[PDB]
């Protein structure tokens, strides 16, 4: 009804042909359809508008309208978001969907407006897997001394240092070059990102560790969103609901497709045995306990309880 022409900028870090990049184009299509072509979303993928930290700041200030980012960089504004960098929180994607779409996920999204952001909903980045260029990693012992890029918060740094890595926080947009030049030995990310950001080309080793699950938050600038009419807000939130469903499906198919592609493209795949997984859990347990104070005890306990019920 009350919809005026709008042009809406949507930058992101992943490649345009990643599952989430394709979901961003899907969001653009749905926004156009629901607005009779009046609201036009322009996507800028592959880091064209900067990494997550810059995208977040652009939404706060108003130079950008929409983005998706990992939860990890949000921890520098809202420490409770660091909960998702704890290892082995979610047994599988069904547990993740339930927790994130339920009250514990909502409690965290509800903290965003005070920082100038609207958490429209959660999208799936996914289960993270270790890659490197030094040696196969199939044992906890093999992590020792690996120079491993991590996401930029205290939880990620502390977890990987606790596992023996030389952990190097770096923005995602600098990662391919750091791997290619061997400024770092490795990194960790979902399979479809390892594929579509081309990290595999410079990472002969992959471990199916699935050690952490990363949500994306699908974000709007609060300053911008608040100036929309209710009908315009409804286009955005309806398109966000449609796109979340599309994105999670595309992500899960993308993960299966990525493992097949990586094996065909000269990547050597390992895993941690059940005994090595046990060693990792035992090693990180005291680190996780100490990190509760930095994240927020009630957030950690609430998320763990929600995951158990799920």
Ligand X SMILES: O=C(O)C(=O)C[C@H](O)[C@H](O)CO
Site for ligand X in 211-250 (CB under 6 A): 214
Q: Flag whether 125 is marked binding.
A: yes
Nearer CB in complex with ligand X: 197/299: 197
The residue within the footprint of ligand X, chosen from 8, 30, 66, 69 (CB under 6 A), is 69
Q: Flag whether 70 is marked binding.
A: yes
Q: Flag whether 13 is marked binding.
A: yes
Q: Could you tell me the smallest distance in angstroms from the CB atom of residue 125 to ligand X? A: 5
Q: Flag whether 132 is marked binding.
A: no
Which residue number places its CB atom closest to ligand X? 13
Site for ligand X in 142-181 (CB under 6 A): 151, 172
Give 170's contacts (C-beta < 8 A, 6+ positions apart): 149, 150, 152, 178, 184
Burial 65-97 (b: 16+ CB within 10 A, else e): bbbbbbbbbbbebbbbbbbbbbbebbeebebbb
Nearest to 280 by CA among 209, 201, 205, 182: 209
Nearer CB in complex with ligand X: 10/12: 12
What are 118's two structure tokens? 């609207």
The residue within the footprint of ligand X, chosen from 24, 125, 210, 247 (CB under 6 A), is 125
Nearer CB in complex with ligand X: 119/302: 119
34 near ligand X (CB under 6 A): no
Which burial class, exposed, middle or buried, applies to 154 when counting CB atoms under 10 A from its CB (0-12, 13-18, 19+)?
middle
Q: Which residue has the tokens 């030094």?
A: 134
Binding-residue total with ligand X (CB under 6 A): 12
Q: How far, in whole angstroms, is CA 160 from its chain's centroid?
A: 17
What are 145's two structure tokens? 């001394």
Which burial class, exposed, middle or buried, applies to 277 when counting CB atoms under 10 A from its CB (0-12, 13-18, 19+)?
middle
Stretch binding ligand X (CB under 6 A), from 8-16, 28-36, 138-146, 249-257: 8-16
- Secondary element (H or E) of residue 122: strand 117-127
Nearest to 303 by CA among 101, 59, 36, 68: 101
Q: Flag whether 189 is marked binding.
A: yes
Stretch binding ligand X (CB under 6 A), from 12-20, 79-87, 138-146, 233-241: 12-20
As beta bridge partners, residue 129 has: 189
Q: Could you tell me the smallest distance in angstroms from the CB atom of residue 173 to ligand X? A: 7
Q: Which residues are annotated as a binding site for L-galactonate?
A: 13-14, 52, 70, 125, 128, 149, 189
Binding residues: 13-14, 52, 70, 125, 128, 149, 189
Contact positions vs ligand X (CB under 6 A): 12-14, 51-52, 69-70, 125, 151, 172, 189, 214
């Amino acid at each position: 009804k009350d919809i005026k022409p709008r042009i809406i900028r949507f930058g992101y870090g992943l490649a345009d042909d990643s599952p989430t990049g394709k979901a961003s184009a899907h969001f653009a299509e749905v926004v156009s359809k629901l607005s009779d072509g009046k609201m036009k979303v322009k996507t800028f993928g592959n880091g064209a508008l900067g990494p997550d930290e810059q995208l977040i700041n652009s939404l706060i200030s108003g130079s950008g309208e929409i983005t998706f980012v990992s939860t990890a960089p949000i921890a520098s504004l809202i420490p409770e978001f660091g909960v998702f960098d704890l290892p082995f929180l979610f047994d599988n994607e069904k547990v993740a969907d339930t927790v994130l779409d339920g009250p514990e996920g909502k409690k965290l999204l509800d903290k965003l407006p005070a920082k100038g952001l609207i958490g429209l909903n959660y999208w799936e980045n996914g289960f993270r897997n270790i890659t490197n260029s030094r040696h196969e990693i199939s044992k906890l012992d093999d992590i020792g001394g690996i120079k491993l890029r991590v996401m930029q918060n205290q939880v990620a740094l502390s977890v990987f240092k606790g596992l023996g890595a030389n952990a190097i926080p770096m923005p995602f947009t600098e990662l391919f070059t750091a791997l290619e030049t061997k400024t770092v030995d490795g990194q960790e990310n979902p399979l479809s990102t390892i594929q579509t950001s081309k990290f595999y080309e410079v990472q002969p080793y992959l471990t199916l560790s699935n050690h952490v699950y990363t949500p994306f938050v699908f974000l709007a600038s609060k300053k911008w969103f608040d100036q929309l009419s209710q009908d315009e807000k409804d286009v955005i939130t309806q398109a966000a609901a449609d796109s979340q469903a599309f994105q999670r499906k595309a992500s899960r198919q993308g993960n299966e497709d990525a493992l097949k592609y990586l094996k065909e493209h000269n990547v050597k795949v390992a895993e941690f045995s059940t005994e090595e997984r046990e060693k990792i859990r035992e090693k990180v347990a005291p680190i996780v306990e100490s990190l509760k104070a930095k994240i927020g005890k009630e957030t950690v306990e609430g998320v763990l309880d929600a995951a158990k019920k799920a």
